[PDB]
Amino acid sequence: SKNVVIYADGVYDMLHLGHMKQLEQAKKLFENTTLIVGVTSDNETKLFKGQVVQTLEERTETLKHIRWVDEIISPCPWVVTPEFLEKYKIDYVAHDDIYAWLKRAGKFKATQRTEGVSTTDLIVRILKNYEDY
Amino acid sequence: SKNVVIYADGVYDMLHLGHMKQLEQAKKLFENTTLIVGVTSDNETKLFKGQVVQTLEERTETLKHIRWVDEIISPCPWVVTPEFLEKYKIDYVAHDDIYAWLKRAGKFKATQRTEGVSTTDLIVRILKNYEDY
Incomplete structure (x- = not known):
């Protein structure tokens, strides 16, 4: 079947089994996928969300070892936009409101x-x- | 080139970038490899080496998400033997004495x-x- 581009994003601080399972789930949404993972910047994460131990570079370098990840966008934009989806040819955004336009x-x-x-x-x-x- | 079977083993408690880099290095020892990773039992690790937070099952389930790992032996034997190498057709053991016979x-x-x-x-x-x- 046709390849489907999936985008997930997050902080991925202190990467753990919970992140890995959610990446696996996003990768497996369809039979043939490309999973693009966005990693949030240090400054925006701390300003808008909370504390982060590892730097962007550390969080990104750890993520590349995960088998489900096909591409990484590091840093990713704090807010996903339609233009961003068009630029990377993203078919679905995978996540667990501000996602209203995505569902629409x-x-x-x-x-x-x-x-x-x-x-x-x-x-x-x-x-x-x-x-x- | 011919496929080369590599074996690495360890505890893999609280899996971190350091484990991942050492698994990547073992996977990349030759151009075409199968990387088999052995995960040590809870009882033997605590008796012979030291404290371990995560159970065998947790350590093994996290390891399977790492892209370099092709097979897992869980639990693995505490001590590698020539018979073990023959059973799994292992060409090289990758590790950082008791490895004397392996070098020989x-x-x-x-x-x-x-x-x-x-x-x-x-x-x-x-x-x-x-x-x-």
């Missing part, structure tokens, strides 16, 4: 976040080896 | 660990946002 255009595909598998979740498990008392 | 057989290939890129290194960077005084 038929270009939205839902993916899911997995709870309890994050990198900081692992550090909490380490800390729980040390009793309060 | 011509089946040893060095790879490098990267410093300063581990998951716990990232947590140290988080903690450094909070001044001692």
Whole structure:
């Protein structure tokens, strides 16, 4: 079947199994896809969303090792626009409102976040080896 | 050229860029390879090496998302033996003594660990946002 271009974006700080599963899901939305992943800039992430440990370069270099990722846009724009979709020939945006125009255009595909598998979740498990008392 | 079977093993706790770079290096030792990765058991790792946060199943499930990994042996034997190499048709073992017989057989290939890129290194960077005084 025809190849389908999928776009996902995010911070991908401290990349963990939850990111990987959501990238796999986006890659597998159709039988033949190209998965483009956008990685948000340090300045815009901190200004608009919250704290980020790793630099853009670190977050991007880790992401390239993930088998589902076919292309990376680093940094990506903070806000997806129709012109951006046209420039990269994107058929669907995969994400878990401001996506209203994407759904109106038929270009939205839902993916899911997995709870309890994050990198900081692992550090909490380490800390729980040390009793309060 | 002929396909070359490479074996690497380890704990792969809290998988990070350093593991990924060492897997990439093992995968790229020759132009055409199959990279088999062995993941050590929880009990043997803790008994012989040290603490491990994630279970065998978690460490294995994260590893499968890495593009360089072609096969996983989970759990792998704590000690590599000649019979193990024969069973899996392994041409080279990639690792960073007890590898003496591997070098004697011509089946040893060095790879490098990267410093300063581990998951716990990232947590140290988080903690450094909070001044001692």
